[PDB]
Design a protein around this ligand. Structure first.
Ligand SMILES: Nc1nc2c(ncn2[C@@H]2O[C@H](COP(=O)(O)OP(=O)(O)O)[C@@H](O)[C@H]2O)c(=O)[nH]1
Ligand SMILES: [Cl-]
Ligand SMILES: [Cl-]
Ligand SMILES: [Mg+2]
Length: 179
């Protein structure tokens, strides 16, 4: 027994959940091949001088799985609720959909709020695209405020593509369970 930790990742379609898991576990961002299946990834992580077995559970974010997806929730040690920093709709869904759904099935499990696609937040074409819809990328203070609102233990931002902040997401996830 390496200590085992079950981590489940949830959030809207296209927020980057699968890329996040693959980039983390393989140290490589998927190119033109992102698994469509909702797999479980097994990673090992050193925490305070001890190896931990992190099982990472990908989920489908579409409405069609609203009855099937929660069957993966039992025995979860920590949830990651993901939204894209460059999709305000995905951010609103953290409060509207994901927080309520997780808490319906798992009242006490820690939640980390994770803002993805960090590399796009200061990307000009992305800012302009959002400005056209009277919108702007989600800022760190906004994400932090959403994290408090949903009782998250931690708010993190990362990019699966550049890997900036990626390892911290899962270190903090583990520490939320273990210390
Ligand atoms: N620029 C950027 N694109 C990303 C990142 N992570 C994922 N993507 C892209 O976002 C899209 C959705 O990613 P995916 O992992 O399939 O999202 P999922 O539906 O939540 O599983 C794909 O086109 C990815 O290439 C990131 O960190 N930066
Ligand atoms: Cl999805
Ligand atoms: Cl917080
Ligand atoms: Mg996926």
């Amino acid at each position: 027994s390496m200590q085992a930790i079950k981590c489940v990742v949830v959030g809207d379609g296209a927020v980057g959940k699968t890329c996040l898991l693959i980039s983390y576990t393989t140290n490589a961002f998927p190119g033109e091949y992102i698994p469509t299946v909702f797999d479980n990834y097994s990673a090992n992580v050193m925490v305070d001088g001890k190896p931990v077995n992190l099982g990472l559970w990908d989920t489908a974010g579409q409405e069609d799985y609203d009855r099937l997806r929660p069957l993966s929730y039992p025995q979860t040690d920590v949830f990651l609720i993901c939204f894209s920093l460059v999709s305000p709709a995905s951010f609103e869904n953290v409060r509207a959909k994901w927080y309520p759904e997780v808490r319906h099935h798992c009242p006490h499990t820690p939640i980390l709020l994770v803002g993805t696609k960090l590399d796009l937040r200061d990307d000009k074409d992305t800012i302009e695209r959002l400005r056209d819809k009277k919108l702007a990328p989600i800022t760190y203070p906004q994400g932090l405020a959403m994290a408090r609102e949903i009782g998250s233990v931690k708010y993190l931002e990362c990019s699966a593509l550049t890997q900036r902040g990626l390892k911290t997401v899962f270190d903090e996830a583990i520490r939320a369970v273990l210390g």
